[PDB]
Structure 1
């Protein structure tokens, strides 16, 4: 039963090229099933589509059902989840419960609906809700949430400020434009809600053009605003980008050291052996075991040394600070 964890990490901790194209393929399947949900809403094509979305749906539901059950069985390799109670502790997690309700509700709809409005009205949301199924472990969302929580203060700040700017400048605009009538005879700014829509659309640099001011006062304010407030709805981008990058680097750094350890262990685990070459043609077996012990040691030494090199600046300074300390003893 070595296969258990094998397929597990083939499914749940994927790495390589095989499992990769597997996940990729299933993703593409999902995406085309969606793009048929798309062409379903178009009357020109709402017939053939809603048809093949009754076969393709069943294909996918059974596919996923099996992939799920097999995943669940192969969740024993991880002791935390071994045994029925652990197993339940598994499906307790978000992505799993999502896949569950997807699959079972597809089964529901296709157990009653097949004998068509509510059906498709739900099927679309399922085809949409499934995309979650690819990011099998959530590193994406965790990256995000961390970066935010870190920078929570900056973000709140700029949000508060932009919000206020919006509010005030929009009120003033409303006051300045509420009478005015478009050349098409109508009125754009009847209320503060409309002005506030304007503000949103404006301060974030979309500018549909459905609401534009006519008066010199309104244009004046809108100009000043447009110049001095848009920036508070465009910081988050730079912030978050820098955060992402930094964090990835931080991580792969840490990974460097997690690589560092095993070699440190193996070095000595080989040294004690080659050194301890006297107490594990029997004598020739002994000679050869000694020779290989020696060789391996010679190998480790180099591999350790190469895996102890200064990833960065802090590393060097720690090292040589420590040498200085060693002198502080001497």
Structure 2
């Protein structure tokens, strides 16, 4: 069993200074490949993307086609799934459903182009950025901060979309028949006036469509201020929500450090009291040294488990309150 579990810890949830190299280097190879792929559409640098790029793509899908099978075979070191029938729920993990789609679809596109063909390689070469960020540790943050703040987000998106649906209809009624400075009509349909609504409600302001009649400029002013506020709201909302969740992980990550150092003191103090009964005499002459020796190491670890807090000046509401109870308690 040793080897399979080692390979799992190495390919998935990886740790150690060399796993970093492996993963980030696979990602940098993906990035060079996607860079050359997007430079193959400049019509002047298109000579650089020769057929050796295509064979560097087929050796890349050769590499990933055994990488997925290595991570599949090294999946049986988990309590959640074992064997071969259990490992199908390992392939419910959506990073693996993304990876399987990537390797098999890129292989299928490379087979038919070797017996709009090269265009499909660009999408399935952009998709390989996502599958090297393992553990999904970024989307789990956002999908929970949005869920905690569902009320305010639903509220301000409803108010902003209601202002966009309403007041980008009055502009179309004020600008249904009016020509530009260059002879065309901007607000021809409702969809043109709504493209304008989304564009001016998010403060882009491209400048293709500006209302020309002086009735429409007033409505654009009103709806501009009174909906730019409600569409700029979620930036501040998620900005509080992201900095409040990482501080709620640096509480429990310190509380996971405090417990084994609050165990290593009590379990060693009982050992230090058990000096009465664990030639059998001089072997007990040595254990009184070590049960007093490691107890002080455990004492140092417990005071290093609570005194370094983390934003470490958070005792500024209870400065004298931690002492003003204890000195009362000593009386």
Q: CA deviation at 1:111?
A: 2.7
Q: Any conservation in 2 of the 1:40–1:50 contact (CA below 8 Å)?
A: no
Q: CA deviation at 1:45?
A: 3.7
Q: CA deviation at 1:34?
A: 1.0
Q: CA deviation at 1:322?
A: 20
| Gap change, CA 1:181 and 1:267, over 3 Å in 2 | same
Q: Distance in 2 between matches of 1:73 and 1:282?
A: 52
Q: Distance in 1 between matches of 2:29 and 2:322?
A: 65
The CA deviation string for residues 237-290 of structure 1, in whole angstroms up to 9 with x for no partner, is: 111111111001101111111111111222222222232234448644433333
Q: TM-score, normalised by structure 1?
A: 0.87
Q: Distance in 1 between matches of 2:174 and 2:312?
A: 64
| Gap change, CA 1:154 and 1:19, over 3 Å in 2 | same
Q: TM-score, normalised by structure 2?
A: 0.87
Q: Which runs of 4+ in 1 moved over 4 A?
A: 317-330
| Gap change, CA 1:265 and 1:85, over 3 Å in 2 | farther
| Gap change, CA 1:191 and 1:84, over 3 Å in 2 | same
| Gap change, CA 1:156 and 1:76, over 3 Å in 2 | same
RMSD of the TM alignment (CA)?
3.9
Q: Distance in 2 between matches of 1:125 and 1:318?
A: 46
| Gap change, CA 1:248 and 1:55, over 3 Å in 2 | same
- More helix, by proportion: 1
The CA deviation string for residues 4-36 of structure 1, in whole angstroms up to 9 with x for no partner, is: 333322221123432223221111111121112
Q: Distance in 1 between matches of 2:205 and 2:150?
A: 28
- SS across alignment from 2:320: helix
| Gap change, CA 1:246 and 1:178, over 3 Å in 2 | same
| Gap change, CA 1:86 and 1:285, over 3 Å in 2 | farther
The CA deviation string for residues 29-69 of structure 1, in whole angstroms up to 9 with x for no partner, is: 11121112212223334454252331121222122223222
- Report how many residues are paired: 323
Q: Which runs of 5+ in 2 are unaligned?
A: 324-330
Q: Any conservation in 2 of the 1:27–1:131 contact (CA below 8 Å)?
A: yes
Q: CA deviation at 1:310?
A: 8.2
Please say which of residues 134-143 and 65-74 is displaced more in the overlay. Answer: 65-74
